[PDB]
Amino acid sequence: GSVQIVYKPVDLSKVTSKCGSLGNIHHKPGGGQVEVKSEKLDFKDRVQSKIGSLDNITHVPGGGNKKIETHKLTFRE
Amino acid sequence: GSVQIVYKPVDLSKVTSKCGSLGNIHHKPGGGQVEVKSEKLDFKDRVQSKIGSLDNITHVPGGGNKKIETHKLTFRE
Amino acid sequence: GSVQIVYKPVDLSKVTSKCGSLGNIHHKPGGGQVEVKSEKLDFKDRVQSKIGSLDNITHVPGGGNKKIETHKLTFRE
Amino acid sequence: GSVQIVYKPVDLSKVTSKCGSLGNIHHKPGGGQVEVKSEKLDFKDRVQSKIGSLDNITHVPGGGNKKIETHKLTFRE
Amino acid sequence: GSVQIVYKPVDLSKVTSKCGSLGNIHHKPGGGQVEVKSEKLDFKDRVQSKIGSLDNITHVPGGGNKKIETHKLTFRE
Amino acid sequence: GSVQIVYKPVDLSKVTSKCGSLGNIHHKPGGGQVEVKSEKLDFKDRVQSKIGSLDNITHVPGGGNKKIETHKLTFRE
Amino acid sequence: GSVQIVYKPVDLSKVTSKCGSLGNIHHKPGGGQVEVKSEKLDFKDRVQSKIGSLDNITHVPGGGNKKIETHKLTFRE
């Protein structure tokens, strides 16, 4: 016997923004307080962690568009 | 016998925004207080965690559009 | 027998922004306080961590667009 | 005519405490938020004020006894 | 004519406490929020005020006894 | 005529404390946030004020006793 | 005529403390945030003020006793 696979996906797509101005943004936090008492840790595989954080962000992109996109073709006898 | 697969998806799509201004934004938190007492940890596989966080964000994109998109073709004998 | 795979995905896509100005941004945090008491650590494989952080960011790209994109073709006898 | 005033108050009093221990005291407040918009002020005579306070106290005297005591003798022709 | 005043009050009094221990005290408030909009103020004589307060106290005296005590003798022709 | 005033108040009083220990005291506040918008001020005579405070205290005297005491004799023709 | 004033107040008083130890005291504040917008000030006579404070204290006297005491004799023809 025989197999034939043809895989020809097309994408002419568009992701876009326009904006006149971003302007007055104020991020102004009064500071907190944290504590943790985690005695014994054992992390193995692909782990991510935070422990005891007190972190502030201000993220102001003039356009933060994103296009996440995956293909997979798999064949097994 | 024989098999024939043809896979030709098309996308001419569009994701869009327009905006005149973003303007006056104020993020202004009075600070809290956290505690945790987690004695013994054991994380194994693909784990994500936070423990004891006190985190503030301000995220103001002039267009935050997004197009998440996956294909998969799988064949097994 | 025999197998034939043809894989010819096309992408003419576009990710875009326009912006008139970003302008007045103020990030101004009053400082907190952290503590951690994690006695014994054992990290093995692909681990990421933070422990006891107090970190501030201000991230203001004049366009922060991104296009994440993966292909995979796998064949097994 | 004539006047005679004699004024001889006596006090042998006592104010007292005993205590074995004061011990474990924890004062641990998560932080609030205040605002005031008082446009025009005019304070004249013997005034005390606070405006817009956010104040924490912890007052632990090993004996906080007090004896407030006033005399006044006044004579007018 | 003539007047004779004799004023000889006596006090042998006592105010007292005994206590074995004060011990475990926890004062632990989650933080509120206040606002005031008082446009025009005019305080004159012996005034006390607070306006817009958010204040926490913890007052743990090992004996907080008190003896407030006033005399007054007044004579007028 | 004639006047005779004699003024001989006596005080053998005592204010006292004993204490075994003061010990474990923890004062640990997560930080708040204040604002005030008081445009025009005019303070004249004997005034005290605070405006816009965010103040923490910890006051732990090993005996904080106090004896406030006033005399006044006044004579007018 | 004639006047005779005799003024011989006596005080054999005592204010006292004993204490075994003061010991473990921890004052540990996460930091807040203040603002004030007071355009025009005019202070005249005996005024005290604070404006825009963010102040922490830790006051631990091994005995903080105090004896405040005033006399006044006044005579007017």
Name beta bridge partners: E76.
Answer: D76
CA atoms within 13 A on the CB side of C1: 11
Name beta bridge partners: G76.
Answer: F76
Written as one letter, the residue type at A14 is K
Q: Which residues in B lie closer than 8 A to residue G32 (C-beta atoms)?
A: 30-31
How far is E69 from D66, CA to CA, in rounded Å? 11
Residue D63's Cβ-count burial label (10 Å; 0-12, 13-18, 19+) is buried
- Where b means 16+ CB within 10 Å and e means fewer, E35-66 reads eeeeeebebeeebeeebbbbbbebebbbbebe
Interface mutation vs chain G, best among D12, D42, D54, D77, most G CBs within 10 Å: D54
Least CB–CB distance from G19: residue in D31, D58, D62: D62
**Strand (E) or helix (H) holding E76:** strand E73-76
E48-49 and C10-11: which strand pairing?
unpaired
Query: Would you say F39 and E38 are in contact if contact means Cβ atoms under 8 Å apart?
Result: no
Contact across the interface for G71 and F71, Cβ inside 8 Å: yes
Name beta bridge partners: F7.
Answer: D7, G7
How far is D76 from E8, CA to CA, in rounded Å? 21
D17: nearest Cα among G17, F67, E25: G17
Sheet of A48-51: strand order equals B48-51, A48-51, C48-51
- Total residues belonging to chain G: 77
D56: nearest Cα among E36, G27, G34, G50: G27
- The DSSP letter of residue F3 is E
Q: Report the structure determination method.
A: cryo-EM
Q: Which residues in A lie closer than 8 A to residue G32 (C-beta atoms)?
A: 30-31
Query: Would you say A71 and C71 are in contact if contact means Cβ atoms under 8 Å apart?
Result: yes
B61: nearest Cα among A68, C61, C15: C61
Q: What is the dihedral of CA B33, B38, B39, B42, to 10 degrees?
A: -140
What tokens appear for A64 in the block? 């933060």
How far is G61 from D64, CA to CA, in rounded Å? 13
Query: Would you say F35 and F17 are in contact if contact means Cβ atoms under 8 Å apart?
Result: no
How far is C17 from B18, CA to CA, in rounded Å? 10
How far is D42 from E40, CA to CA, in rounded Å? 8
How far is B56 from E67, CA to CA, in rounded Å? 51
Query: Would you say D67 and F17 are in contact if contact means Cβ atoms under 8 Å apart?
Result: no
Written as one letter, the residue type at A68 is I
Residue D71's Cβ-count burial label (10 Å; 0-12, 13-18, 19+) is buried
Distance from CA of G34 to the nearest CA of F (A): 5
Q: Chain F neighbours among D 8-47 (CB < 8 Å)? A: 8-47
CB neighbour list of residue D27: distance below 8 Å, 6 or more residues apart = D56, D58, E27, E28, E56, E58, F26, F27, F28, F29
Contact across the interface for B54 and C64, Cβ inside 8 Å: no
Q: What is the CA radius of gyration of chain A?
A: 24
How far is F61 from F65, CA to CA, in rounded Å? 9
Cα-based distances in Å from E19 to D20, E58, E67, F14, G49: 6, 19, 19, 20, 41
The 3-state DSSP class for residue C29 equals: coil
Our measurement of the distance from residue A4's CA atom to the centroid of its chain's CA atoms, rounded to an integer in Å, reads 37
Phi, psi of B61 (to 5 degrees): -70, 135
How far is C26 from A25, CA to CA, in rounded Å? 6
How far is D10 from F13, CA to CA, in rounded Å? 9
Cα-based distances in Å from G27 to B36, C17, E55, F59, G23: 20, 51, 17, 10, 13
Q: Using a threshold of 3 CB pairs under 8 A, tell whether chains C and E touch.
A: no
Query: Would you say F39 and B38 are in contact if contact means Cβ atoms under 8 Å apart?
Result: no
How far is F65 from F54, CA to CA, in rounded Å? 28
The 3-state DSSP class for residue C59 equals: strand
Contact across the interface for A53 and B56, Cβ inside 8 Å: no
CB neighbour list of residue C64: distance below 8 Å, 6 or more residues apart = A61, A62, A63, A64, B61
Q: Which residues in C lie closer than 8 A to residue F56 (C-beta atoms)?
A: none
Sheet of F25-27: strand order equals E25-27, D25-27, F25-27, G25-27
Q: From start to end of G1-77, where are the E strands? A: 2-7, 10-11, 14-15, 25-27, 43-45, 48-51, 66-70, 73-76
**Strand (E) or helix (H) holding D47:** none
